[PDB]
């Protein structure tokens, strides 16, 4: 039965169990993962509204100084580029990405999308022809199995993960791991089927719009936004589009029970429907640089294209 | 069928017989790079371009004897493994060579039958492709996608005119988008016949997705020997970027007023949906790392055209 969301935990909304998984409002945790920083600021005036508590550690600035300034004074060169690439009324999937030279944190990756009248700003630290060779490999795959096989090994060879899996959905939302490149000693997941209440209904929806989510350390503690609610509206901040969005404690409990430390999955969208995920497991905590994650963001599109062209020939 | 080429006593290509030219076998390359062909198993350089001495910085006839084991020691193992016998000619492998004379060279390699083809170009030593990608995806229709695709590629490439050339069902075409430098004629809106791209070109351009012409006034640099030592036949160059352009098509681009032309094939459902056309008024060699982004934007747009045209239909 599809039911609507609870309030979050910070708006008096109940604690989650296995009975009511589909009612968690995962899109509004009011908190980011600690490996980066996140501001939200005004769409038009550039007024810095909220920030993650740890934004000082990362930006080498105090909140009182930060929040008492505009994005014009803070990001003088970037601000017009933000305005130009993210005009008003544009979709929240659209991101503008840039590099900074921040004196305290070194080179900083700035990712920015708009959510109504709210520019969400992310900050991460950031540090030869392997994707091109990967591109032509996938295309010259003879069939959907050799496509799936090369994608998973390519993805592993680029990223360095313990278990990379291409996971495919079925018509009734049941899934099954169709290919994997794994670490030597790890027990296979190849050909396991998994029930429909594993990736729940509110999750699969969000995963069709935004095509890359991750979890760095399944033992880390969510860094909360400050203030937790959006001053514009006095309502939760839509952090569904943010990659720094903290992962749910239901999900973190699960991954710890498997001996997993880090997780990454690229979505594969065919016909505007979630065809499958390129999931990645790691036994230790593992942060992937944003510039390297851009390579995987590309592979998701590339694979989504070939997935279709392969299935056209299977008929 | 095709005629014999000019170098094997074939007829000259008038506008009458404009669909029987063997475009894939010109027996020559463009002067801004260097082509070597090599045997699959042994690795002996069977044929080279006459300008090879320039870019490879070696003597002319000394390279004919040597093997790719001796020449490219580190990459030679990778070429065999990455281009296995039986693979399609569309599968390319690429790497960067650090040569002693020419400096950073760009090696691109693909296999055809028993023979490998090795293309050497000069090459250089960031978030615009990511921003473009999302700019294509948030585009709310086909026309709004078409403007963003052309305007993207121009700002990346610095070309004087970037067009998007959509194909009607009977090989007729139309320009549905066109970013361009100020003070040029507008080809936005105009349609053109199906004689323009012949039957062989259209078929070849579905399999192979990027060609160019860096200089429309330069001369082709022939292969030596012209024919393939194995087969004593024409060397299939129809998957090489350094391949020379049909002399009709250069003679055309001069009458237009173009020094350098490039294109990217947008393929939807096995068929050729359209091309991304780039014109420059002057000669312009686009370097391999920048060209890679354009091939990338081809697949992206090929994907996005399918999503958008579903919303129309
Ligand atoms: C209470 C309901 C359930 C639940 C909650 C939940 N899951 C996700 C996202 C998931 N779940 C995945 C499940 C798998 N684990 C595996 O080992 C395999 C197969 C190899 C599968 C299919 C996956 C892959 C995801 C996506 C993210 C990831 O790759 O780890 C969420 C959303 C998390 C969020 O913060 O948005 C939630 C709330 N998980 C259950 O397993 C089930 C008991
Ligand atoms: C002899 C018969 C004809 C002919 C031959 C021919 N054309 C190509 C490649 C073409 N033709 C194109 C048509 C256009 N040229 C333009 O300037 C525009 C305007 C936007 C169009 C539509 C195009 C786009 C190509 C691809 C490359 C490019 O110019 O961007 C070939 C292939 C040559 C080869 O070596 O592969 C041949 C043989 N063209 C005629 O117009 C007609 C006289």
UniProtKB/Swiss-Prot annotation, chain B:
Domain of life per record: Bacteria
Chain ranges of the PAS domain: 20-88
Binding, a tetrapyrrole: 18
Domain GAF: 141-305
PTM comment, free text: Contains one covalently linked tetrapyrrole chromophore. Lacks the cysteine conserved in plant phytochromes (at the position of Met-248) that binds chromophore. An engineered sequence used for X-ray crystallography forms a thioether link to biliverdin through Cys-18. The natural sequence can bind phycocyanobilin and phytochromobilin in vitro, but the identity of the natural chromophore is unknown.
Effect of residue 249 to A: 100-fold reduction of chromophore-binding activity
Coiled coil: none
Recorded family membership: In the N-terminal section; belongs to the phytochrome family.
Function noted in UniProt: Photoreceptor which exists in two forms that are reversibly interconvertible by light: the R form that absorbs maximally in the red region of the spectrum and the FR form that absorbs maximally in the far-red region. Also has a slight blue shift for the far-red maximum. Could also absorb green light. May participate in regulating pigment synthesis like the carotenoid deinoxanthin which could protect the bacterium from intense visible light.
Protein name: Bacteriophytochrome
Species per Swiss-Prot/TrEMBL record: Deinococcus radiodurans (strain ATCC 13939 / DSM 20539 / JCM 16871 / CCUG 27074 / LMG 4051 / NBRC 15346 / NCIMB 9279 / VKM B-1422 / R1)
Gene name of this polypeptide: bphP
Full protein stretch here: 7 to 321 of 755
């Amino acid at each position: 039965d599809p039911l609507p969301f609870f309030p979050p935990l910070y708006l008096g909304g109940p604690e989650i169990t296995t009975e009511n998984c589909e009612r968690e409002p995962i899109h509004i945790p009011g908190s980011i993962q600690p490996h980066g920083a996140l501001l939200t600021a005004d769409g038009h005036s550039g007024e810095v509204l909220q920030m993650s508590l740890n934004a000082a550690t990362f930006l080498g600035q105090e909140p009182t100084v930060l929040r008492g300034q505009t994005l014009a004074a803070l990001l003088p060169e970037q601000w017009p580029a933000l305005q130009a690439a993210l005009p008003p009324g544009c979709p929240d999937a659209l991101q503008y990405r840039a590099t900074l030279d921040w004196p305290a944190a070194g080179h900083l990756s700035l990712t920015v999308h708009r959510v109504g009248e709210l520019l969400i700003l992310e900050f991460e630290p950031t540090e030869p022809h392997a994707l091109r060779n990967a591109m032509f490999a996938l295309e010259s795959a003879p069939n959907l199995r050799a496509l799936a096989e090369v994608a998973t090994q390519t993805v592993r060879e680029l990223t360095g993960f313990d278990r990379v899996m291409l996971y495919k959905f079925a018509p009734d939302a049941t899934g099954e791991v169709i290919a994997e490149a794994r670490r030597e000693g790890l027990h296979a997941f190849l050909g396991h089927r998994f029930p429909a209440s594993d990736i729940p209904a509110q999750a699969r929806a969000l995963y069709t719009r935004h095509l890359l989510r991750l979890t760095a350390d399944t033992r880390a503690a969510a860094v909360p936004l400050d203030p937790v609610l959006n001053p514009q509206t006095n309502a939760p901040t839509p952090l569904g589009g943010a990659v720094l969005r903290a992962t749910s404690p239901m999900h973190m409990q699960y991954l710890r029970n498997m001996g997993v430390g880090s997780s990454l999955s690229v979505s594969v969208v065919v016909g505007g429907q979630l065809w499958g995920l390129i999931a990645c497991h790691h036994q230790t905590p593992y942060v992937l640089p944003p510039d390297l994650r851009t390579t995987l963001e590309y592979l998701g599109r590339l694979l989504s294209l070939q997935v279709q062209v392969k299935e056209a020939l299977e008929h």
